[PDB]
Amino acid sequence: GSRVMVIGGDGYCGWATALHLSKKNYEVCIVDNLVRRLFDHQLGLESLTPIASIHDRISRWKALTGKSIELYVGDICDFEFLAESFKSFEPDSVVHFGEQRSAPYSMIDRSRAVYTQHNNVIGTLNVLFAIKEFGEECHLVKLGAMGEYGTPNIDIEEGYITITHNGRTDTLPYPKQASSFYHLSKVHDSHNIAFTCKAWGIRATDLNQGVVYGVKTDETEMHEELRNRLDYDAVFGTALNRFCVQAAVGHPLTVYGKGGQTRGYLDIRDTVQCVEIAIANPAKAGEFRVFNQFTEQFSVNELASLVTKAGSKLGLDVKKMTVPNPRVEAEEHYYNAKHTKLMELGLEPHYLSDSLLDSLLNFAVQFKDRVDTKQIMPSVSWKKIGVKTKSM
């Protein structure tokens, strides 16, 4: 074999996924403009782990396994490029990881908020038109976001909710409440895709994924040049990965506000597993499937405690600090998000364990010398965002 186009395949989730699908014998190609690497240069950021170029990454995989991952370098917002890549590869499935995924980045200034929505929304529209025009039966596996739902006072369902209002009943799209221009772009994406499923018969699966943690997967650990990136800076780094790196370098864990913010999380190993499951068990024509893709819920305070305990076993004397929250969000809220669709399809989860934390912490300690502590604290305010293009 089945042919899979992995848009955003040079990224954190995409690279691990591309290697896994190739290993699982799918014919794979990567479509990426590598803009994520440019952002690192422009903002003065760097991965904890040194990573190889996309060309060397692909070359190494071929040298080790003999398998060739085709590469198409370009911006999917450029339809000519996307169309040519689609017609050249003829994918049976498209996994779309190719979007600006940082909430902080989307809040830096007007230019970055606009770039985020334009890049994400238009790129996704182009993908939908490419599928419709060149391969209508192609299954779109889209990366959405648990953040699309916000933090309502009721249980969060997997995309849909059956409501009884004024004596009548109907099943409707779950109300969306995004908290950043980035999360908003995903809400727009989801609405756009749902429409094309009904109007054109597109088959798609929206994976509303929670926060990913970890850096190792079976494939990326096979050789140093296959190593994935591990972000710890305040722009692209996420909660758990950030805390592990902070613990390793002796920086107090950065708890934003009260720390009651609760979210779904999952090991990167499950990210690749879930994507493969979505591909192996495709949506039907005209069907817009929605899966909440995470394995466990944790509050920020809970993560801090887990990392502190894990760090103690390594003599890291982990400390915690309360950082004035740069974001506008509920710091104490109800949270009960449903997640059974992937489990019903055979997901064998890697729940957060002492072993994982020990491994991730030792990893951060291993490359502690590469950590730029100046990038640990957040400097992007949700409320103070301006129109002048900022230079970090």
Ligand X SMILES: NC(=O)c1ccc[n+]([C@@H]2O[C@H](COP(=O)([O-])OP(=O)(O)OC[C@H]3O[C@@H](n4cnc5c(N)ncnc54)[C@H](O)[C@@H]3O)[C@@H](O)[C@H]2O)c1
Ligand Y SMILES: O=c1ccn([C@@H]2O[C@H](COP(=O)(O)OP(=O)(O)O[C@H]3O[C@H](CO)[C@@H](O)[C@H](O)[C@H]3O)[C@@H](O)[C@H]2O)c(=O)[nH]1
Selected binder of ligand X within 4, 5, 6, 12 (CB under 6 A):
12
- Counting Cα atoms < 13 Å in the Cβ hemisphere of 103 gives 21
Minimum separation from the CB atom of position 117 to a copy of itself (A): 6
The letter for the amino acid at 81 is F
Query: With CB cut-offs between 5 and 8 Å by kind, which of a copy of itself, ligand Y, ligand X, none does residue 14 bind?
Result: ligand X
**Binding pattern to ligand Y, positions 227-266, x when CB under 6 A?**
-----------xx--x-----------xxx----x-x---
Of 35, 52, 83, 249, the residue at the interface with ligand X (CB under 6 A) is 35
Q: How many CB atoms lie within 10 A of CB 290?
A: 24
Q: Does 99 bind ligand X (CB under 6 A)?
A: yes
Q: Closest CB to a copy of itself among 72 and 181?
A: 181
The secondary structure of 13-42 as a DSSP string is HHHHHHHHHHHTT-EEEEEE--HHHHHHHH
**Total Cβ atoms within 10 A of residue 160:** 12
Distance of CA 73 to the CA centre of its chain: 20
- The answer to whether 344 contacts a copy of itself (rule: CB under 8 A) is no
Site string for a copy of itself, 366-385 (x = CB under 8 A): ----------------xx-x
Give exposure, 24-40, as e/b (b: 16+ Cβ within 10 Å). eebbbbbbbbeebbebb
Q: Is the dihedral of CA 269, 119, 264, 328 positive or negative?
A: positive
Contacts of 277 (CB under 8 A, 6+ apart): 342, 345, 346, 347
* Per-residue binder mask for ligand Y (CB under 6 A), 101-140, x = binder: xxx-------------------------------------
Give the count of beta carbons closer than 10 Å to the beta carbon of residue 79.
18
List of residues 6+ apart from 75 with CB closer than 8 A: 33, 35, 81, 123
Beta bridge partners of 226: none
State which amino acid sits at residue 232.
Answer: Y
- Our CB check for ligand X shows the closer of 221 and 317 to be 221
Contacts to ligand X from residues 299-318, by CB under 6 A: none
Residues near ligand X (CB under 6 A), total: 26
78 near a copy of itself (CB under 8 A): no
Residue 321 phi, psi (nearest 5): -140, 150
Binding flag, residue 36, ligand X (CB under 6 A)? yes
In angstroms, rounded to a whole number, what is the distance separating the alpha carbons of residues 370 and 390? 25
- Confirm if 212 and 266 have CB atoms less than 8 A apart: yes
Q: Is 98 in the site for ligand X (CB under 6 A)?
A: yes
By the rule CB under 6 A, 145 interacts with ligand Y = yes
Q: How far is the CB of 323 from a copy of itself (least distance, A)?
A: 18
Quick note: the x/- pattern for a copy of itself over 166-195, rule CB under 8 A, is x-xxx-xxxxxxxxxx--x--xx--xx-xx
Nearer to a copy of itself by C-beta: 131 or 316?
131
- Separation between Cα atoms, residue 34 and residue 17, nearest integer Å: 16
**Interface residue with ligand X, options 6, 22, 26, 33 (CB under 6 A):** 33
For the beta sheet containing 296-299, the strands, ordered from the edge strand earlier in sequence to the opposite edge, are 211-213, 262-267, 296-299
Contact indicator for 302, 253 with CB cutoff of 8 Å: no
Stretch that binds a copy of itself, among 146-154, 220-228, 292-300, 363-371 (CB under 8 A): 146-154
161 binds, among a copy of itself, ligand X, ligand Y, none (CB under 5 to 8 A by kind): a copy of itself
User: What x-and-dash track marks residues 192-231 binding ligand Y by CB under 6 A?
Assistant: -----------------xxx--------------------
Contacting positions for a copy of itself (CB under 8 A):
79, 83, 110, 113-114, 117-118, 121-122, 125-126, 129-130, 132-133, 152-155, 161, 163-166, 168-170, 172-181, 184, 187-188, 191-192, 194-195, 198-200, 328, 334, 382-383, 385-387
Q: Rule CB under 6 A: which residues touch ligand Y?
A: 101-103, 145-147, 209-211, 238-239, 242, 254-256, 261, 263, 300, 327, 329
